[PDB]
Amino acid sequence: DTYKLILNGXTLKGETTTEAVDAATAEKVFKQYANDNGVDGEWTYDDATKTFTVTE
């Protein structure tokens, strides 16, 4: 299924997606993505819309 990540680094904002077998697997992709792209902070997950957010 399609999972989405909403990033808010402060100045820099964006959204990415990934096709993953389950939510834990998408979470690993998104956590590495946020780490590799300098966004570090508060995490949310809405299973009903398969949407993560991370906010600096």
Author numbering: 1 to 56
Question: What does the literature reporting this entry say, word for word?
Answer:
Thus, we chose to engineer the loop L1 of the 56-residue immunoglobulin-binding domain B1 of the streptococcal protein G (GB1).35–38 The solvent exposed loop L1 in wild type GB1 is a type-I β-turn with lysine at the i + 1 position and threonine at the i + 2 position that lacks a COi+1 → COi+2 n → π* interaction. However, to have a better control over the turn conformation, we decided to introduce a type-II′ β-turn. Through subsequent X-ray crystallography and computational analysis of synthetic GB1 proteins with amino acid substitutions at the i + 2 residue of the β-turn, we show that amino acid side-chain identity and its rotameric conformation have a direct influence on the strength of an n → π* interaction. Gratifyingly, the thermal denaturation of the GB1 proteins shows a good correlation between their stability and the strength of an n → π* interaction at the β-turn.
Despite the low helix propensity of threonine, we were surprised to note the shortest d and θ between COi+1⋯COi+2 at the type-II′ β-turn in 5 with an En→π* of 0.46 kcal mol−1. An overlay of the type-II′ β-turns of both the β-branched amino acids valine and threonine revealed a clear difference in the side-chain rotamer conformation. Valine in 4 crystallized in a gauche− (g−) side-chain rotameric conformation, whereas threonine in 5 crystallized in a gauche+ (g+) conformation. From the statistical analyses of protein structures, it is known that β-branched amino acids favor the g+ side-chain conformation over g− in helices. Thus, Thr25 in the α-helix of GB1 with a g+ conformation engages in an n → π* interaction, whereas Thr11 at the i + 2 residue in loop L1 with a g− conformation lacks the n → π* interaction. Moreover, our dataset revealed that Thr with a g− conformation at the i + 2 residue in the β-turns does not engage in an n → π* interaction. Therefore, despite the low helix propensity, the n → π* interaction in threonine at the type-II′ β-turn in 5 is a result of the altered side-chain rotamer conformation. 5 with the strongest COi+1 → COi+2 n → π* interaction displayed the maximum stability (TM) and 4 with no detectable COi+1 → COi+2 n → π* interaction showed the least stability. The Ramachandran plot of the i + 2 residue in the type-II′ β-turn of 2, 3, 4, and 5 revealed that, as the strength of the n → π* interaction increases, the torsion angles of an amino acid in a non-helical region in the absence of the stabilizing intramolecular hydrogen bond are gradually altered to occupy the right-handed α-helical region.
